[PDB]
């Protein structure tokens, strides 16, 4: 695609009897994490997680930290408010999640911005795509919506998503150009797993690719075996790259009617793979 995104992921969770609610924030460019903050660190601060961010100066790290400390206290206040909205006891633990950010095209221009929130894993409130209105999922979120309309929050989101977000995303893409703007193609192969005397498993592997977006499909006689293909969730290798496999059960002997097809940004052209015994 050559288009890119920046996302921040905020989590705040209550733990009554075990101190004040914990606050964690992580920042991503595409599938690369680049910052973290944990209010449970001995010295809480926004800390680098990718080498291209370490070069930012202190005023950068000072601002990122002071904002996250404020948010630690604000999200504790939100968790008290949300407990109220749902008439919930002070003994249970609850979770607030937020993710926000921007998508830019291969020219650095904003495609669209995002800000969504979840309470206890349930969609709660989302900034609409117009960046000026909200969608509340229930009468509790409606309360949050009235506060935000009065606080004039959507206008602040628009100014952040159109301005700072894409400018700093653009800057990161340049500072981390050798990695963020490098698609590494998958290394692939097909393995063969005898099951019985009359059927076997063909497993198609994709290793070492980046970013994680990828297509793996089996075809039998040129027709997709989507209902019969077992997919694992794309998984991280630990080294920035990802892994994935697709598997199909085939009658023994018919193995050549089956093809595995691989799409990824790193490959010059899509791949067709067969078992070669």
């Amino acid at each position: 695609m050559g288009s890119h995104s920046m996302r921040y992921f905020y989590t705040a969770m209550s733990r009554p009897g075990r101190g004040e609610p914990r606050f964690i924030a992580v920042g991503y460019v595409d599938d690369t994490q680049f910052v973290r903050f944990d209010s449970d660190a001995a010295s809480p601060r926004m800390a680098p997680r990718a080498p291209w961010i370490e070069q930012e100066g202190p005023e950068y790290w000072d601002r990122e930290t002071q904002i996250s400390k404020t948010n630690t206290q604000t999200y504790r206040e939100s968790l008290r408010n949300l407990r109220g909205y749902y008439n919930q006891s002070e003994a249970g633990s609850h979770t607030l999640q937020r993710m926000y950010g921007c998508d830019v095209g291969p020219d650095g221009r904003l495609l669209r911005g995002h800000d969504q929130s979840a309470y206890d894993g349930k969609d709660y409130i989302a900034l609409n795509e117009d960046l000026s209105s909200w969608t509340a999922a229930d009468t509790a979120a409606q309360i949050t919506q009235r506060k935000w309309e009065a606080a004039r929050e959507a206008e602040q989101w628009r100014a952040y998503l159109e301005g700072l977000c894409v400018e700093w995303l653009r800057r990161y893409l340049e500072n981390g150009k050798e990695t963020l703007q490098r698609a590494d193609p998958p290394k692939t192969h097909v393995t063969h797993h005898p099951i019985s005397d009359h059927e076997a498993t063909l497993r198609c592997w994709a290793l070492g690719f980046y970013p994680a977006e990828i297509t793996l499909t089996w075809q039998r006689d040129g027709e997709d075996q989507t209902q019969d293909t077992e997919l694992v969730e794309t998984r991280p290798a630990g080294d920035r790259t990802f892994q994935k496999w697709a598997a199909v059960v085939v009658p023994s002997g018919e193995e050549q009617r089956y093809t595995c097809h691989v799409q990824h940004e790193g490959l010059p052209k899509p791949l067709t793979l067969r078992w070669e015994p």
């Binding site: 950068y60 601002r63 904002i67 604000t74 999200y75 949050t144 602040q156 700093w168």
Partner: peptide, 9 residues
């Protein structure tokens, strides 16, 4: 860079 801290929920 993060957004300015805003209004509580």
């Amino acid at each position: 860079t993060v957004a300015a801290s805003g209004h509580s929920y």
